[PDB]
From a paper:
Collagen VI assembles from heterotrimers of three different α-chains into microfibrils, but there are many gaps in our knowledge of the molecular assembly process.
Therefore, a further local masked refinement of the top ring of the bead, which has the highest resolution, was applied. The structure shows that the trimeric coiled coil region, identified in the mini-collagen VI structure, is also present in the intact tissue microfibril with a network of hydrophobic residues in the internal coiled coil. The α1 C2 domain, which was mobile in the mini-collagen VI, is present in this structure and packs against the α2 C2 domain from the symmetry-related partner. This interaction is only formed upon higher-order assembly of the collagen VI heterotrimers into tetramers. Two interchain disulphide bonds are observed at the end of the coiled coil between the α3 chain and the α1 and α2 chains. There is one difference in disulphide bond pairing in the CXCC motif in the coiled coil region between the recombinant mini-collagen VI and microfibril, where in the mini-collagen VI, residue Cys2387 α3 bonds with Cys602 in the α2 chain, whereas in the microfibril, the equivalent cysteine in the α3 chain bonds with Cys604 in the α1 chain. A cysteine residue from the α2 coiled coil region (Cys600) appears to be connected to and contact the collagenous region, suggesting the formation of a disulphide bond between the trimeric coiled coil region and collagenous region within the microfibril.
Numbering used by the authors:
A (entry chain E), B (entry chain B): 587 to 611, 828 to 1027
C (entry chain C), D (entry chain F): 2193 to 2436
E (entry chain A), F (entry chain D): 581 to 605, 815 to 1027
The structure:
Amino acid sequence: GEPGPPGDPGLTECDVMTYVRETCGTELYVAQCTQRPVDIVFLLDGSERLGEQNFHKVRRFVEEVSRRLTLARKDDDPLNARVALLQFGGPREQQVAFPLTSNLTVIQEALASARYLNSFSHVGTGIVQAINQVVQGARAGARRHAELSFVFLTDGVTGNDSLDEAVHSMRKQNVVPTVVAVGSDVDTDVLSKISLGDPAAVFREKDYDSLAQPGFFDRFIRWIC
Amino acid sequence: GEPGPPGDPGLTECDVMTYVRETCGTELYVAQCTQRPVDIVFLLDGSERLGEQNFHKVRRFVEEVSRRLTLARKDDDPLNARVALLQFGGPREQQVAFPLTSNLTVIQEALASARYLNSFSHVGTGIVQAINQVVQGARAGARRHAELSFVFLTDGVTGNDSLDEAVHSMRKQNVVPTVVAVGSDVDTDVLSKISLGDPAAVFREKDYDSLAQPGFFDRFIRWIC
Amino acid sequence: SGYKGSRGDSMDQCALVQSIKDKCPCCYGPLECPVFPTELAFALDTSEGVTQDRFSQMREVVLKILDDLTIAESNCPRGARVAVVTYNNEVTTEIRFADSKKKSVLLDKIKNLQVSLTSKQQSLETAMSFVARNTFKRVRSGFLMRKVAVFFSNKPTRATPQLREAVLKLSDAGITPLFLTSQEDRQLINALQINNTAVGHALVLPAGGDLTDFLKNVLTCHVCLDICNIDPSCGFGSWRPSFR
Amino acid sequence: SGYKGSRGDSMDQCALVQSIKDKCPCCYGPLECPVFPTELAFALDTSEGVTQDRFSQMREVVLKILDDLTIAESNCPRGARVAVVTYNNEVTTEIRFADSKKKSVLLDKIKNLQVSLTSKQQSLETAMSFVARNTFKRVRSGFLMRKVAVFFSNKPTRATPQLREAVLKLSDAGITPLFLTSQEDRQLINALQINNTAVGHALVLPAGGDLTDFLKNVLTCHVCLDICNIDPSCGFGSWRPSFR
Amino acid sequence: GPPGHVGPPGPDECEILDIIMKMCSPDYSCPITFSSPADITILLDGSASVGSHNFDITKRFAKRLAERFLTASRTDPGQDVRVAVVQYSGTGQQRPERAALQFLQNYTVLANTVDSMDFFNDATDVMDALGYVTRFYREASSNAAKKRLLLFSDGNSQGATPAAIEKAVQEAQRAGVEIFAVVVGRQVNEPHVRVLVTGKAAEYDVVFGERHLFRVPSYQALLRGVFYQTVSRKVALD
Amino acid sequence: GPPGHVGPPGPDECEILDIIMKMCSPDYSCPITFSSPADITILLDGSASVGSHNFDITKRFAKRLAERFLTASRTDPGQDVRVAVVQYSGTGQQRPERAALQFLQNYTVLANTVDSMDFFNDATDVMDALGYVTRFYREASSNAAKKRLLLFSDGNSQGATPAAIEKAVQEAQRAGVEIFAVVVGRQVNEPHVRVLVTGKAAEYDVVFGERHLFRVPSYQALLRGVFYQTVSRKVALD
Ligand SMILES: *[C@@H]1O[C@H](CO)[C@@H](O[C@@H]2O[C@H](CO)[C@@H](O[C@@H]3O[C@H](CO)[C@@H](O)[C@H](O)[C@@H]3O)[C@H](O)[C@H]2NC(C)=O)[C@H](O)[C@H]1NC(C)=O
Ligand SMILES: *[C@@H]1O[C@H](CO[C@@H]2O[C@@H](C)[C@@H](O)[C@@H](O)[C@@H]2O)[C@@H](O[C@@H]2O[C@H](CO)[C@@H](O)[C@H](O)[C@H]2NC(C)=O)[C@H](O)[C@H]1NC(C)=O
Ligand SMILES: *[C@@H]1O[C@H](CO[C@@H]2O[C@@H](C)[C@@H](O)[C@@H](O)[C@@H]2O)[C@@H](O[C@@H]2O[C@H](CO)[C@@H](O)[C@H](O)[C@H]2NC(C)=O)[C@H](O)[C@H]1NC(C)=O
Ligand SMILES: *[C@@H]1O[C@H](CO)[C@@H](O[C@@H]2O[C@H](CO)[C@@H](O)[C@H](O)[C@H]2NC(C)=O)[C@H](O)[C@H]1NC(C)=O
Ligand SMILES: *[C@@H]1O[C@H](CO)[C@@H](O[C@@H]2O[C@H](CO)[C@@H](O)[C@H](O)[C@H]2NC(C)=O)[C@H](O)[C@H]1NC(C)=O
Ligand SMILES: *[C@@H]1O[C@H](CO)[C@@H](O[C@@H]2O[C@H](CO)[C@@H](O)[C@H](O)[C@H]2NC(C)=O)[C@H](O)[C@H]1NC(C)=O
Ligand SMILES: *[C@@H]1O[C@H](CO)[C@@H](O)[C@H](O)[C@H]1NC(C)=O
Ligand SMILES: *[C@@H]1O[C@H](CO)[C@@H](O)[C@H](O)[C@H]1NC(C)=O
């Protein structure tokens, strides 16, 4: 075929602009995934504003994400990362799901029978129950320093009876928040509180179906690892 | 399958908008082609700024246009429209081309042997030569009132030694123009002069290749017919 | 899936204009014709035997009609656009829909318009077709656009299929012709109208004397007739508001 | 067609800033560290036997280091970001890269930070890995982004392969660590340095007495060393421009 | 498949009014006349599907609706113009007390109740809400008056099947009150809201359908413009 | 296919000066120094491919170039700094006559000639133009001076082949003048322009091409910004 097109400029205009701004005076650079010891526990609110079809789409997204990430063999601080999910709700004041575990078949089986609450859910009670459950699991799984990152898959608009206390407890519990809001309708206060004073620790997706968009999936997997 | 979607609202916001603007206080409505007696003569200036490959593209465009429009059998004021084209230049102060005729085989042969001038076009001399030639042809073809429309395939940037006199001759010769400029670089003066004081008698094409865009081709055939 | 559902209802064409009219300040006070923006196409005739004085009379008639009407100088869809042509066995455009931009310049052009004495014999059907398929090749947009053509004749038209076909084409084109000629012809009225459906009347003009009567008739209930409030008995017939 | 051409030449990272720096008014007058916006990560050790008075000493050291440095309160790529953590057999983040927004609030938080008296036995490798793969999990952008970590130890480190692997990972992460400990260990230097190419010095800290003698060195020479105008003979070794 | 149902008819008087008033520079606002005595009780959503700020904007819109209806010059001093407000939530959650709220001419109790209700944080429940509304009408409203009603809905509620809502709306019709549906957003079970509007799923009358349904894209858009004027005027017209 | 050649290097001093001055707010503008005496004769297009207005903006750019070069503080009063201007067109059209124009120092006469030249409306001929330039230098410029030249072109010319351009540029090189190419737009015969820039088609040097080529997308953008000063300073640097 024909010769390839000529190369781009050595230092484009934006390059020099960034240089000058840097000397005297967005996007954040994160080192790509390296299978570092990680432990992630999702959180999907049961509020009826989610949607049965949207619940199915979120199930698909979660299983795809679990497929993409490498899964550790076991515990006692090997390399690789684990995964957990729960679907707490308002009614019954409690709900449970599978604990952290890398055995993917358990994940598939639990997801298959996943029940969509379609009911109110106060985020504070959910998060405190989640942190209690994951603390219990971690204690059952030795020290495994690694980390503890929580991904909030929800708009977050819900009852805040004990939001602040749970946020404080999570803050003291060496956690790394991360939020993926869906839809234009979102309250900035809840996002800010969960983000722990970060402007770029939140992603936005116009529709729940976009969770299957390859671009957003790649960005999310890059951010988490 | 599933039922169709709901229909268009009653007097859509734009509908009432136009109604109110009309009551007290763009696009022009043209009756679709009805094969009324029309005589059309093209004009492709040989200015070196056209391009040999762009000349081939214009040849293809003219071929397509002459193919789509219906062609009359003969003269003496029958229905249907004819076609003509010429490629006048500046050097040698003249050029010749096939006259108005519906024998598409002659059009094919002329296009096949079509020579890209890569030369100049004192648009005034070219247009006066064209009007003389088409007047001679029309006289050879009886009255055939019909009409006489010219299509200008040129940016128009060129020497204007005798532009105004030829413009006046065109005015007196019951002519109707239609100009399709291509490229950002265009002079408003020449376009206005050849458009005969019209703001919507000019089409703008981003690039020569856009001449093959079905949308623009359909719009052009709709305007001319 | 099924195709798109049917277009819904509407508030009719006229009565909505009545409503918006009462409600838009200063637009129900001083009326100015045309009632709605419209195209007007004058077509003069130079057929042999046309007396120059009669040409002057028609020139005065057209000038008065223009002055009584405003124009749409800008691109705002409000006001009258004009197009003046001359016709014979052939046709020759003089001023088209685009050149005219100011009332004074249009009046000056029309007054200074060349008078072309000639001898070619009349053929009104050619002018009919010309206006049908050349002058109205492009017209300004507007949901309530009105289009009117005014013609001339120094001799009654013949009775042939070509003219009836031509007027059918005119009607199909949306025009609302108002012919003017010295004397009536029941055949002309019959050919113009169709199946008890009028296309456009054929008035009468004088060989000298008073003009304000018929001039008033045309200016009120023909050239700038409100599509909504048609006068009680201005012109015997049935009228035909809106497109045809 | 063939693939895209190669990247073009560059004016070199070092002296383009030299040029722009002699060129951006008032930016070549008063100096304020850090020379370029950078991340600084303090990690504190609560290892068994860490004397509380010594903890106060390190607290004052960190407080002074913070005061000497400015902060990037806004999102403009200019100023210092901070991250303070405590490490033991396990680790516990105290303040991350996000919460810090003002100098006074940061100073108050660090001064009011709880002292976690404990008895767990130390293992510096866990803290190395934590900082390598958790603290720097995300950092601010910038073509000349600079990263630095400061640590502590109330006991000399062991001589094990895992330490070499951890320091290799740190180097791969772009960090430029500056450890601090009571007493030297040639084995520590050897593990840090790679084939005679240093990765980070291991300075010394006092059990009392004067401090500024080494505070000046650390501040002028490691934390906010100029990228290109390096001090002639500060610290035995070979220095490093940035990255590895 | 079969073609879709006819789309909504054109702008009514009140939005053509504000569109003309926007630029054309004669009465304005959006006048109303209660031709015959009647009542209205705008029902407000309180399920989580709305949310805090959405619930608050709905409260504001309800307040505006009530004030506009009450201020509208009564067509007869010898008779009354009557409005009321109540909040519905999960089963058996409909403030105020049964005997508490009557038809009102003043604005004290109505305004305080409008600005004092609380979000409930429970799944949408339409059955008991509709039963409460219809029984309250049956017991309270005077026999002669021909009343009207409005409702926010999403067609979603636990333990909801089309036949049950068919029966409930049939009971409401037996009570003898026409109903109108106003909804916000598109995350709505279309068949259920269509049923609620019509009462006969098989025969969805186009005229009854389009007239009785108002659609809004977003909660914020509900308050913007003169939509409130249009809905109130449409409620007024018999 | 094979990969494309290396792209243009990073921006030089002048435009980085401009960008720092744009927002960062010491001598500025774009100082030049003619280290050693030389000559420059900016060659301006005269074929229709440019046009009337585009030819006018080219004339303005030429006038500015002459002003900036002449005003540049001569590095030595003992020797001179030399500039000239000519317009080329179809075969045998290079104003002024061969014996008229010398190296000019006062700016007014050169400026008057620049503002008085008329568009030729003759085909794009580059053979005779290059011959004119090279023979004029051969006859005129003093032996010691090592000169420089600019040239506008599109690489398109009737009766032109790569061999002819190569031979002409070789003759110019034998005359002993290095050449630089500045072009506008992209309706350009890339091989011919590259050959003119280098003269060694097969062994084209990427560094030579990138150093000796200037690309401007639009005629209007040519005068805009600091492009003129950047190119003039590049001409200045050895
Ligand atoms: C761990 O992952 C497995 C899938 O890899 C989960 O489901 C397991 O699926 C296999 C496939 O049929 C079942 O086969 C059984 O395996 C056992 C050995 O574990 C073997 O002794 C049986 O004869 C049979 O082949 C397996 O039963 C099934 N796991 C369980 C617990 O029933 C599994 O649920 C995941 N969690 C575990 C194993 O705790
Ligand atoms: C509610 O009504 C009271 C008084 O009732 C008025 O007379 C009724 C027959 C009927 O026509 C109501 O609509 C009238 O408003 C209004 O003002 C109260 O007046 C009494 C009389 O002294 C006084 O004691 C109260 O404090 C007044 N209420 C106040 C000050 O809030 C009252 O304005 C009406 N509601 C609103 C919202 O204004
Ligand atoms: C154009 O040149 C003339 C005279 O040249 C001057 O002397 C040369 C040696 C060289 O140094 C040029 O740069 C000088 O400008 C300038 O105008 C003339 O000036 C003289 C002295 O005042 C006067 O007698 C003449 O009448 C002037 N000629 C005129 C008015 O036509 C002129 O300034 C130069 N143009 C510039 C500098 O743009
Ligand atoms: C929960 O959060 C809200 C706001 O984030 C707190 O206050 C509410 O603020 C919104 C702002 O739009 C108002 O509309 C509400 O009216 C406020 N609450 C009330 C009761 O009026 C609220 O205090 C927090 N906690 C609780 C228990 O609601
Ligand atoms: C006119 O059209 C015809 C076809 O409609 C063209 O084709 C030639 O027609 C003549 C008529 O007898 C034949 O003898 C030739 O053999 C046809 N050409 C070929 C290639 O078969 C004709 O060429 C057109 N007129 C002209 C002048 O070319
Ligand atoms: C018509 O011809 C005249 C000269 O015969 C042209 O006049 C020039 O127009 C350009 C347009 O910007 C001006 O910049 C020049 O200053 C004018 N004069 C000269 C001497 O160039 C005119 O441009 C031509 N019209 C066109 C090309 O549309
Ligand atoms: C008959 O009269 C009607 C009445 O307007 C008209 O629309 C129609 O075109 C006429 N011709 C035919 C064939 O119906
Ligand atoms: C060897 O030194 C080079 C040069 O600094 C360095 O890049 C590399 O990582 C070193 N490798 C080892 C094994 O020391």
